[PDB]
């Protein structure tokens, strides 16, 4: 009843110790390293390792090895052997070539339909398009470098598919295979892989994740070769069709091979060297963009870095494999010193691939993903961190007081700016006289008027509480889908029972009787569901009483996934709360965390190891100010007070410690490799916002000491400083020399000031420049932006980013990933053809090898194709697939990307875009003209489709809850179902039996609360689903919904409280029937008689798609009127002219650049970004920081709700009950805090989470600066027809459509047009006027909802909190 589905892609890490333990057991000696793992692995093997070594094939192979006939190797030896595999017979050559030819022809045939539709709409014009006919003549002979990677990927994928299917069918299956990939023999399993080459006489042992990595490597290289072949053919047809880069694919394959040779020569250590060729790309870019001194300095530093990496790699390699079984495997070219020659070749090839082209050079960042991943040694990473985190630092007291004074200055300045008042001081008698005047007047001086004595004087201030702590725990910030550390006494349960001594096994089983069932959980969700003594105010009482101090349960567990750290549940709560308070209250004061010449430079610093040098004396001088501002002690200072007293242990499964008998306490075990004590603070990830704002304060101090200006920007772990300074040029000095001197002096300052607080920078992280910045991997140069867009589509393949191999989620992932070759790559057609290659592969080729359905989805798809062939009167089942793959997924088809997404990115109504997409696509067969209006032309295929769409049987149920959850839902079974809907009832029935009474009591009332929420707003006569969304979001059922939707995204909802990683067959059956119903949706939606033969077919004269959409959406719900959801499509409403009309009569877009082509150029205009209107409301005057964040969220929700529904004849009781039930105030006391809205159309201006707030184009933002728009004539015409009355068409989307139209016409004609004119269809535009609501709300049901889900209500506004609001 429990099956095991294994991974198809690499999601975890490759383990040094799993491989080492398995190989040490198999070959009976130290395999990769001489550590404790091999010794314990040979003494007490696991049961799966014994199973592997016990097979007959393994027995024969190791018998052959112990006689000296085969030789051990390293997994990188076999990576280089596999990636070189060419062996194939003439039949296998013919077979692979035929398969690839068919895939390519079918992808071009699918793409023809969309390309024809686009060329028909723009008015530009088995394959009807001439463009793709020429492309098909180009692509009818794949090259050999492409067939190589396609064959390799196909083989490795066949092997993995075999294993996964046979392991779902049978548990414990091992795949023995020597015929799939000729020459190699594989022994696969989920616990290890054994690879054997018979002609070379080699054998290796590795893990399952390493096989996954090999398969992913071959897929990545295949995707690179595919993309570049496609785009080179496109660029040979027309220089504007392909991508901006252009590669030679007989050089890229040499790069692949030489990197493989580097990894075969240096073993696992070679990934050091591979990790250093990023700086080589950077140096080649700076040799183009920079001037002499900067680029010379960078080049020399880079060469030093590379050769230091290679020397360290050689030294570590020779020291590791010396007393192991791999000592004879080190090449002679390592001590010879000739490796350097090989390295040389590598770099030269890179310099040839770049071609002195910023486009190639910025695309080439995919080389760092394409060689695999290393095996991470966990114990030695711990041993490297230890030395830096155990050191003693020496400070001057002046340094600490100036840093603290700069922090306090930032806080004072931010209070005066935001709250119009200094913070409240409690020792104001320390300020001399000038600062007393600044305090009395509520002002502050500037940085130029500031001094260092001023910072030392500010360092003496103490504060009174300004912000407050939440008293009830928030469940959505603490519940997670990750693992948790056991207590310090139950830490030995992290390792197999065989690897632990015999005295630890007797002790674990007696200690497990003293702990609760929540303390023995191993997952966060299970930690919280099993707590039968939970309380909302537990975290508050911990933080207030400091129960995290001197706690005998604290431990730190490090895993390999760069040293992810964990601790038990209480301390994890406290960590999350401190980070949340800093993010909520404090980051508003730190906004850069989210003379005859003006010299200018720039410094780039890597702050990834920043935290290891932080001590209490440096962090907590500032976290003390944050403590005093919140009224607490030690909350923001928790790390450096608690962690110095615990043990850091590596708790990976195959890396146990050596415990000498008599010892069962962790704080008594000897320190060794992978286990130590006295960590002096700096655990990574924890307390990161504190360290970011401290870095910003130190930068202020540096700018005060150096007397220049600074413009910082901290984005993750990379900071970029811009330094400016006014100087007077000397005699014979140029500007470049002035900037270089500025850079050098600023660098000495930065080094001095960082070393003063214990951070010793080094020449590897930091580099100086003047103009350019690699802004978080984004090359920009002269306002033009150069993307690395191939790096984003490397892992596009069949079953990606899905749970239980869901077909629709895989299609959606493929589509959204492939859109990067259009949104960034700036090529519509390359993205289209790559998408279709992988969609056709997923549907036509891989849908019959499902691991759980096994061919059922393929039989369903064949049923659908036969239905389509009969309905649309097609030719065969090959035209029906071309049709199915171009139909929207909303109607049950297979197209993940709609046409509007090629022109603008956001739409406010999906149904109109779906219907327009269907019309444009069916035009390919019916031969309609997308420039005319709609008529009927001898061919009723579009009439049949639209008639079937508007004609169906009504069956509505739970209308208002469904329109609260998704304001664009459709109802009557007229759309496809998603996973949140299927698994909801299962989640609530699992949660109804949890020991935690909060989740149990919530889950036992879920259906009744749903019934009340339906029967709450069902008598308001015009339905406004975006106002129902606000009513929904202002109630405690929203939180329970969020937690349930979190839990329903896991594998095996059923087995959460069962302690197993297997899947229950009820989960499988539920998912399987979801998949089958979703596939045959199109059979259900298009009946073979239009729901009756005698129903008058839809006449398409004087038809409006927007009225048709409104009718469909209302009939599906049986609601008379639905307002504020239907909005026209811009792609259908606007007609595109290129000549200057008599009277223009539309929007006019014009080119301001002088060049005929504008791709990769910059213009004089300002960038267009969308940027919806700014709200017009009046905020009252009260002290905002007396309320927490959630109380202000609720206040703004009730303000919006009092705005929209001010017209119903129950509004007093409605708003009174809402205010009392949610905030604790009455309506009169609460109405004094409501923002008052000055607008009148909430149908235009309401801001809900279910509405877009930005309408950008499908074009990079640098590219919008070439064009200029003018919207005066359309305003004249729209004002003469309607006149001072609101209408339902969006303005930003019209501009975005015009801009992307310019881009796309340039792609297709090789000439950018001078101007474009957009003329609207006025029968598509209607009035959007705010309605007068009638009927009244159900107050009994409102009370019932508030009372059943009461445990998810926020904090109530107190009286000691409401008196202080107006003081």
């Amino acid at each position: 009843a429990n099956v095991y589905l294994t991974d198809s892609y690499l999601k975890g890490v490759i383990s040094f110790s799993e491989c080492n333990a398995l190989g040490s057991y198999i070959f009976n000696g130290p395999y990769l390293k001489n550590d404790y793992t091999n010794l314990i692995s040979r003494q007490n093997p696991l049961i799966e390792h014994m199973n592997l070594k016990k097979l007959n094939i393994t027995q024969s192979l190791i018998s052959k090895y112990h006689k000296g006939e085969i030789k051990l190797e390293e997994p990188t030896y076999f990576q280089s052997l596999l990636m070189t595999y060419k062996s194939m017979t003439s039949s296998e050559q013919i077979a692979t070539t035929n398969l690839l030819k068919k895939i390519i022809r079918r992808a071009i045939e699918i793409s023809d339909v969309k390309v024809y539709a686009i060329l028909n709409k723009l008015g530009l014009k088995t394959i009807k398009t001439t463009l793709l006919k020429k492309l098909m003549c180009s692509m009818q002979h794949p090259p050999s470098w492409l067939i190589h990677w396609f064959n390799l990927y196909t083989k490795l994928n066949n092997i993995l598919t075999q294993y996964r299917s046979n392991e779902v069918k049978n548990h414990g299956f091992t795949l023995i295979d020597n015929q799939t990939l000729s020459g190699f023999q594989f022994i696969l399993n989920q616990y290890g892989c054994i690879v054997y080459h018979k002609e070379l006489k080699r054998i290796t042992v590795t893990t399952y994740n390493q096989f996954l990595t090999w398969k992913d490597i071959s897929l990545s290289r295949l995707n690179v070769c595919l993309i570049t072949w496609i785009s080179n053919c496109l660029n040979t047809l027309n220089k504007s069709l392909g991508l901006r880069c252009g590669f030679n694919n007989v050089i890229l394959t040499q790069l692949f091979l030489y990197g493989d040779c580097i990894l075969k020569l240096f073993h696992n250590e070679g990934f050091y060297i591979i990790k250093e060729v990023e700086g080589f790309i950077m140096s080649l870019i700076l040799n183009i963009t920079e001037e002499d001194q900067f680029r010379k300095r960078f080049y020399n530093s880079m060469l030093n870095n590379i050769t230091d990496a290679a020397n360290k790699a050689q030294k570590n390699l020779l020291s590791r494999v010396c007393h192991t079984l791999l000592d004879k495997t080190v090449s002679d070219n390592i001590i010879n010193g000739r490796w350097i020659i090989l390295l040389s070749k590598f770099l030269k090839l890179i310099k040839l691939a770049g071609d002195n082209n910023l486009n190639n050079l910025s695309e080439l960042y995919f080389l760092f993903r394409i060689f695999g991943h290393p095996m991470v040694d966990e114990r030695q990473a711990m041993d490297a961190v230890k030395i830096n985190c155990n050191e003693t630092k020496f400070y001057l007291l002046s340094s600490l007081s100036m840093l603290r004074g700069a922090f306090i200055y930032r806080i004072i300045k931010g209070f005066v700016n935001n709250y119009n008042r200094w913070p409240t001081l409690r020792n104001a008698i320390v300020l001399p006289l000038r600062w007393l005047t600044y305090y009395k007047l509520n002002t502050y001086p500037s940085l130029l008027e500031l001094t260092e004595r001023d910072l030392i004087v500010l360092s003496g201030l103490r504060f009174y509480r300004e912000f407050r702590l939440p008293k009830k725990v928030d469940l959505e910030m603490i519940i997670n889908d990750k693992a948790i550390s056991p207590p310090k006494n139950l830490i030995w349960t992290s390792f197999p029972r065989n690897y632990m001594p015999s005295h630890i096994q007797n002790y674990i089983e007696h200690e497990k009787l003293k702990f609760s069932e929540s303390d023995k959980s191993r997952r966060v969700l299970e930690y919280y569901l099993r707590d039968n003594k939970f309380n909302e105010c537990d975290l508050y009482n911990c933080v207030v009483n400091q129960s995290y101090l001197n706690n005998p349960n604290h431990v730190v567990s490090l895993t390999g996934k760069r040293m992810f750290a964990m601790q038990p549940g209480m301390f994890r709560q406290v960590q999350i709360l401190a980070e949340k308070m800093i993010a909520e209250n404090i980051l508003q004061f730190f906004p850069e965390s989210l003379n005859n010449y003006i010299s200018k430079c720039s410094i780039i610093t890597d702050l990834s190891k920043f935290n290891q040098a932080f001590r209490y004396e440096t962090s907590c001088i500032c976290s003390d100010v944050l403590d005093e501002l919140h009224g607490v002690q030690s909350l923001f200072s928790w790390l450096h007070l608690t962690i110095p007293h615990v043990t850091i242990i590596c708790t990976y499964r195959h890396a146990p410690p050596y415990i000498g008998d008599h010892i069962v306490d962790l704080n008594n075990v000897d320190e060794q490799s992978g286990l130590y004590r006295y960590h002096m603070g700096g655990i990574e990830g924890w307390c990161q916002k504190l360290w970011t704002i401290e870095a910003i304060s130190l930068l202020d101090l540096i700018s005060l000491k150096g007397k220049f200006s600074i413009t910082a920007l901290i984005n993750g772990d990379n900071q970029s400083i811009d330094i400016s300074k006014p100087i007077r040029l000397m005699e014979g000095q140029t500007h470049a020399q002035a900037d270089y001197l500025l850079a050098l002096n600023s660098l000495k300052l930065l080094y001095k000031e960082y070393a003063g607080i214990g951070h010793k920078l080094k020449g590897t992280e930091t580099y100086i420049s003047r103009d350019m910045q690699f802004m978080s991997k984004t090359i920009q140069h002269n306002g033009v932006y150069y993307p690395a867009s191939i790096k984003k589509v490397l892992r596009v393949g069949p079953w990606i980013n899905t749970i239980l191999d869901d077909f629709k989620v895989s299609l959606e992932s493929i589509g959204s990933l492939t859109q990067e070759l259009e949104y960034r790559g700036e090529s519509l057609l390359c993205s289209l053809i790559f998408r279709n290659v992988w969609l056709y592969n997923q549907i036509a080729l891989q849908l019959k090898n499902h691991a759980l359905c096994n061919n059922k989805l393929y039989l369903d798809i064949l049923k659908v194709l036969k239905h389509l062939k009969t309905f649309f009167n097609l030719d065969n089942i090959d035209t029906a697939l071309t049709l199915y793959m171009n139909l929207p997924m909303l109607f049950g088809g297979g197209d993940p990307n709609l046409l509007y997404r090629s022109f603008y990115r956001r739409t406010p109504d999906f149904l109109t875009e779906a219907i327009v997409h269907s019309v444009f696509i069916l035009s390919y067969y019916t031969n309609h003209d997308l420039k005319d209006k709609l008529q009927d032309l001898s061919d009723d295929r579009l009439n049949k489709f639209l008639t079937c769409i508007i004609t169906f049987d009504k069956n509505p149920n739970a209308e208002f809850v469904t329109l609260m959850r998704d304001p664009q839902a459709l109802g009557s079974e007229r759309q496809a179902k998603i996973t949140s809907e299927i698994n909801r009832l299962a989640v609530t029935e699992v949660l109804s039996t949890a020991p935690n009474k909060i989740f149990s009591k919530s889950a036992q009332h879920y259906t009744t609360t749903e019934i009340d929420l339906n029967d709450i707003m069902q008598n308001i006569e015009p339905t406004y689903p975006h106002g129902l969304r606000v009513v929904y979001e202002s109630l405690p059922f929203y939180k329970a919904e969020k937690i349930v939707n979190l839990i329903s995204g896991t594998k095996s909802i059923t087995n959460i409280l069962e302690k197993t990683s297997a899947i229950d067959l009820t989960d499988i059956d539920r998912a399987t029937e979801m998949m089958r119903k979703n596939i045959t949706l199109l059979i259900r939606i298009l009946p073979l008689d239009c729901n009756r033969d005698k129903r008058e077919i839809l006449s398409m004269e004087n038809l409006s798609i927007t009225e048709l959409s409104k009718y469909v959406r209302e009939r599906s719900w049986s609601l008379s009127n639905i307002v504020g959801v239907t909005s026209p499509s811009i792609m259908y409403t606007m007609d595109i002219k290129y000549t200057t009309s008599t009277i223009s009569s539309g929007i006019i877009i014009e080119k301001y650049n002088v060049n005929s082509l504008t791709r990769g150029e910059r213009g004089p205009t300002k960038p267009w970004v969308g940027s919806s209107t700014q709200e017009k409301k009046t905020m009252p005057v009260y002290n905002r920081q007396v309320l927490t964040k959630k109380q202000r969220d609720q206040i703004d929700l009730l303000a919006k709700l009092d705005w929209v529904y001010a017209s119903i004849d129950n509004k007093d009781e409605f708003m009174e009950e809402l205010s009392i039930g949610t905030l604790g105030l009455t309506y009169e006391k609460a109405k004094k805090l409501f923002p008052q809205y000055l607008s009148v159309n909430y149908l235009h201006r309401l801001t809900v989470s279910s509405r877009p707030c930005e309408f950008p184009a499908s074009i990079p933002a640098y590219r919008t600066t070439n064009y200029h728009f003018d919207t005066s004539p359309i305003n004249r015409i729209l004002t003469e027809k309607y006149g001072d009355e609101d209408i339902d068409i969006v303005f930003q989307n019209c501009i975005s459509f015009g801009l992307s139209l310019m881009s796309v016409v340039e792609q297709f004609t090789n000439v950018c047009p001078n101007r474009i004119i957009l003329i609207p269809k006025l029968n598509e535009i209607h009035l959007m006027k705010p309605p007068i609501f009638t009927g009244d709300v159900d107050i009994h049901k409102l009370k019932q909802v508030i009372q059943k889900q009461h445990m998810f209500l926020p904090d109530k506004i107190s009286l000691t909190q409401y008196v202080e609001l107006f003081l």
Binding site: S398, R404, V430, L431, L433, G460, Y464, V544, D624
Partner: protein, 62 residues
């Protein structure tokens, strides 16, 4: 000129106060949190005094 002298004296005193307070803060470290003396050096704040007040005003019942 007497007020000028008094002003310079107060400025020096403010400088000394800044230094000495930073030294008091930075030397209440993990060892004082372990020995249980950190609150005698950093001070008592609002939440702890609120707990003391709600304990004193609600002896057992009220």
């Amino acid at each position: 000129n007497i007020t000028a002298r008094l002003d310079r004296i107060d400025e020096k005193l403010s400088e000394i106060l800044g230094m000495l307070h930073t030294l008091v803060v930075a030397s209440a470290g993990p060892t004082s949190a372990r020995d249980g003396i950190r609150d005698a050096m950093v001070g008592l704040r609002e939440e702890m005094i609120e707990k003391i007040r709600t304990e004193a005003l609600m002896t057992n019942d009220r």
